[PDB]
Design a protein around this ligand. Structure first.
Ligand SMILES: Nc1ncnc2c1ncn2[C@@H]1O[C@H](COP(=O)(O)OP(=O)(O)NP(=O)(O)O)[C@@H](O)[C@H]1O
Ligand SMILES: [Mn+2]
Ligand code: NA
Length: 427
């Protein structure tokens, strides 16, 4: 097993960090043994999966055990977000908490591990954090079940014609990480015009396309960071430009332009898609260096927004506490405004940032006028260059011109049409 998970790890106030490399058995070997002990010792246990794919991983791994899975049992399994979102309202309590993929910089994930750390530090519970890359540790080349040959090469950032034959002359299957859906689209189009089979994985295509990968065995999986955790792509090569999109609050608005360098935790997950089989050598082809300074991203403000509203006094998981942008509690809402906040998160697909600004500032849950009364520069444009228009229930023609402008609502995985359903009062 692992050394620190013999006994006493289940003791209130005990925080155990399992730095375990990719493919080392966190989800399917360690976790079911932690759960067998928890059930034996009759300890109320929370298990947090980052995503639906890892949650189904856990269902197989915990098959034949009395466990309760959340979209008799004393073990509850649910997503990082599910945990945080239910605490935005008669709270359930657990004396043991296990967080799988505890490096994830999704704001729900940062908020969940901050809450659980704050509890463990108060002797309310025992916490286990499992990840290849514990927050604090900078290691882009962790250990692997088999060998990986890593080589720096120039990687195309978009369509290309000649000069990159090493890409198409490769005889195995590849996972190519791209910083955005749109960049993913341009790479896929070139690969198919070169006669390669491609499946694109991202927030729009995952639920329908991920299970085709096993079955169709495409030449290429062109994937965003959606495939960094619990995606089994069964490839022999990763291509990794080591970039990601960077949602950033700039002049009171959330922008989504350009890229940043990935963190080491991200590079390590991307590389970790390969080298999962002893006695096989796989390839990791990358371009450039990593950047662990992600303190500028809106994710940290979004994490405080969530943590401030599920909580004394709470901090982020110790090593991340430096990236909390304001003093603890800054973002706490009244109970009534928190209800509205939760509704916008869970029912309207809002970002934490947008949901907080609306719930904090808008008198009533029925108001939609904030969607057209913003400053002129906040107007939202269709691909054809015209400003989006819609009709309020009284037939008034509106221009989509929100007071609080979050680019994430209008591209990269979200559609203007779904925001208009909200803005038009069809919600
Ligand atoms: N062929 C395999 N190689 C490695 N692990 C495997 C394999 N088949 C099933 N598994 C399980 O898959 C899981 C992968 O190991 P794990 O430590 O969870 O990786 P990781 O760093 O967490 N990478 P990821 O899980 O995708 O984020 C373990 O729980 C293994 O028991
Ligand atoms: Mn895993
Ligand atoms: Na396809």
């Amino acid at each position: 097993p692992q050394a620190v998970v013999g006994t006493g790890w289940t003791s209130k106030g005990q925080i155990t960090v399992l730095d375990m490399h990719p493919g080392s058995g966190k989800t399917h070997r360690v976790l079911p043994e932690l759960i067998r002990q928890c059930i034996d010792r009759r300890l109320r246990t929370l298990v947090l999966a980052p995503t639906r794919v890892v949650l189904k991983e856990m269902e197989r791994a915990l098959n034949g055990k009395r466990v309760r899975f959340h979209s008799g049992a004393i073990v509850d399994v649910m997503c990082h977000a599910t945990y945080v979102n239910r605490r935005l309202l008669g709270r359930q309590n657990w004396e043991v908490a296990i967080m799988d993929e505890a490096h994830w910089t999704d704001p729900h994930s940062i908020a969940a591990r901050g809450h659980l750390y704050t509890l463990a530090k108060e002797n309310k519970c025992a916490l286990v954090l499992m990840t290849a890359t514990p927050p604090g540790k900078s290691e882009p080349f962790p250990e692997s079940n088999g060998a990986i040959t890593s080589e720096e090469r120039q990687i195309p950032d978009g369509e290309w014609r000649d000069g990159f034959d090493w890409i198409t002359e490769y005889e195995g299957r590849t996972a190519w990480f791209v910083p955005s859906i749109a960049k993913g689209g341009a790479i896929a189009r070139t690969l198919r015009q070169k006669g390669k089979s491609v499946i694109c994985l991202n927030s729009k295509t995952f639920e329908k396309d991920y299970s085709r990968v096993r079955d169709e065995k495409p030449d290429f999986v062109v994937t965003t960071d959606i495939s960094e955790m619990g995606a089994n792509l069964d490839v022999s090569r990763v291509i990794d430009g080591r970039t990601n999109i960077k949602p950033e609050e700039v002049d009171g608005k959330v922008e989504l332009t350009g890229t940043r360098r990935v963190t080491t935790a991200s590079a390590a997950q991307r590389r970790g898609r390969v080298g999962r089989q002893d006695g096989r050598t796989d390839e990791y082809i990358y371009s450039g260096q990593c950047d662990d300074d992600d303190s500028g991203l809106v994710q940290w403000k979004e994490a405080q927004i969530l943590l401030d509203n599920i909580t004394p006094v709470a901090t982020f998981y110790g090593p991340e506490q430096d990236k909390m942008p304001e003093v603890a509690g800054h973002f706490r809402l009244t109970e009534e405004k928190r209800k509205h906040f939760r509704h916008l998160l869970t029912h309207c697909d809002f970002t934490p940032w947008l949901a907080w600004h609306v719930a904090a500032n808008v008198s009533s849950v029925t108001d939609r006028s904030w969607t057209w009364e913003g400053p002129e520069a906040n107007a939202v444009d269709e691909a054809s260059g015209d400003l989006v228009t819609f009709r309020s229930p009284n037939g008034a023609e509106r221009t989509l011109r929100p007071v609080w402008k979050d680019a994430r609502m209008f591209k990269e995985g979200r559609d203007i049409k779904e925001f208009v359903a909200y803005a038009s009062g069809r919600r």
